[PDB]
Amino acid sequence: MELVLKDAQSALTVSETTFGRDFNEALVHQVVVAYAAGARQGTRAQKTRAEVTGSGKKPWRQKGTGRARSGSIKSPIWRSGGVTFAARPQDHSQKVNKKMYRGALKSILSELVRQDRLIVVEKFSVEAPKTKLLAQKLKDMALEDVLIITGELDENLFLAARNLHKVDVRDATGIDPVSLIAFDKVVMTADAVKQVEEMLA
């Protein structure tokens, strides 16, 4: 599988089972859903009738009066009563198998290739940590909404990309499927390709 490069107009040999796999939408949808469920914090609670501040006394007697039977003022049918099925803090994280996660990444990286949403360059550096320099470089590349994966830790690039919301900069380890989809273009360093292909076999 060969990936032509943008700047030097060379090639780069990759695994076809990685970058030419057919797009398995149901797998990718499962993984993207589980990622967005993993982001989910799940911090809420309501009060039951057990937890409502009150007293456990019958507001009136059982019979004799003309009113309906009642046992508790904390009743979930009363105003300022309990919630019937009051919630607890719960964990919404799903399990994704490892081979399913890699199948999804190999699917959407193959799809970004088929959609020409993947750009491969040898190097992507900014000299000084300036967002003005980064916006100039991306304008020269004709890029606005982009993910930038670099096989190294470039701090000037992180700082120059921190203020731009259209732009995100990742390590090759810190890539995610939802960000590979949510961004319009993806720029990979060829070293970052070598690391991604090695991780993903």
Partner: peptide
């Protein structure tokens, strides 16, 4: 006044009612 209503409910039922008013055991 629903607080003077508290009185109303709290004790126009705690008045308790007197009782049935026909000396009849339907026995």
């Amino acid at each position: 006044m629903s607080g003077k209503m508290t009185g109303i409910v709290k004790w126009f039922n705690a008045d308790k009612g007197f009782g049935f008013i026909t000396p009849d055991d339907g026995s």
